[PDB]
Amino acid sequence: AIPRVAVVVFILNGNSILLGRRRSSIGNSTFALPGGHLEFGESFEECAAREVMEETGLKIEKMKLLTVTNNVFKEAPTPSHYVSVSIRAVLVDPSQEPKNMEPEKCEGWDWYDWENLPKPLFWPLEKLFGSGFNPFTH
Amino acid sequence: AIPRVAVVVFILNGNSILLGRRRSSIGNSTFALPGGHLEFGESFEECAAREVMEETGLKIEKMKLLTVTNNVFKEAPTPSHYVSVSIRAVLVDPSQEPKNMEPEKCEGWDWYDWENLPKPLFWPLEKLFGSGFNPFTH
């Protein structure tokens, strides 16, 4: 039980962000960002681009740190504390279609408009958005 | 070997911040902020107050997130990668003096004016400042 670092990516395309339904013990079936565990020696930007590539195939650019959130899943059956570093990015090719590279972990990735976000959102994302956080302007 | 989360605290007192020379494997003899490892189940604000109390005896309040930095210590004798969450705080009692609670880990804590910081600064702290980061106005 130690806090673990994740990097999560807001890929902005027009007024939309990329989200996908998790297949996981935590946040199962909820809509979440691409992202994953930060590796030893890795920068935030390296992690963001690598995770997006592994999960979606998408090539990203203009990465920028947004914020960091503390996410303790106190009532999970196994200890889960994540510190999630949010990165903004855009596509090198805004017409590039997302692929579902890891179907065991995600139902598929799709674009959602900022004014018509899907439900249910993964709790850390719900919590961050409930605070007023806006990845387009932060 | 994994990235580990630390919380570091900019205690603002007038135009000064608290710094102390480290006694450590990492950043030995360099001036650094109070702070340390985030514990499982702890918030960033709770960690800031706890670490400051442990290291300095100071009572702080109005803890606010500033930023996060990614610091891989290639010079360390063991794999050392810290994701360092910066918190701003102030003293509950502006007359309270710091105390060197852990003299085996620090040479002592003092206040330094923003325009006349001491040298050598611990390099992650120096890098943050070199970017234009100002904890008073951020």
Ligand SMILES: Nc1nc2c([nH]c(=O)n2[C@H]2C[C@H](O)[C@@H](COP(=O)(O)OP(=O)(O)OP(=O)(O)O)O2)c(=O)[nH]1
């Ligand atoms: N993927 C994703 N993870 C998030 C979000 N918000 C958030 O706190 N996290 C935290 C909780 C996740 O369990 C944690 C690690 O990400 P993950 O569950 O996608 O793990 P992963 O398999 O991609 O990690 P890896 O094996 O690729 O290193 O990051 C989000 O919106 N998306």
Ligand SMILES: Nc1nc2c([nH]c(=O)n2[C@H]2C[C@H](O)[C@@H](COP(=O)(O)OP(=O)(O)OP(=O)(O)O)O2)c(=O)[nH]1
């Ligand atoms: N104290 C402190 N640590 C910093 C700074 N910048 C930075 O990257 N770190 C990283 C490097 C340290 O090896 C790492 C852990 O902090 P630390 O050495 O003070 O750890 P600690 O013993 O106080 O942790 P704990 O046992 O009290 O919980 O945090 C800073 O300005 N101050």
Ligand SMILES: [Mg+2]
């Ligand atoms: Mg992944």
Ligand SMILES: [Mg+2]
């Ligand atoms: Mg993932």
Ligand SMILES: [Mg+2]
């Ligand atoms: Mg400590």
Ligand SMILES: [Mg+2]
């Ligand atoms: Mg410390």
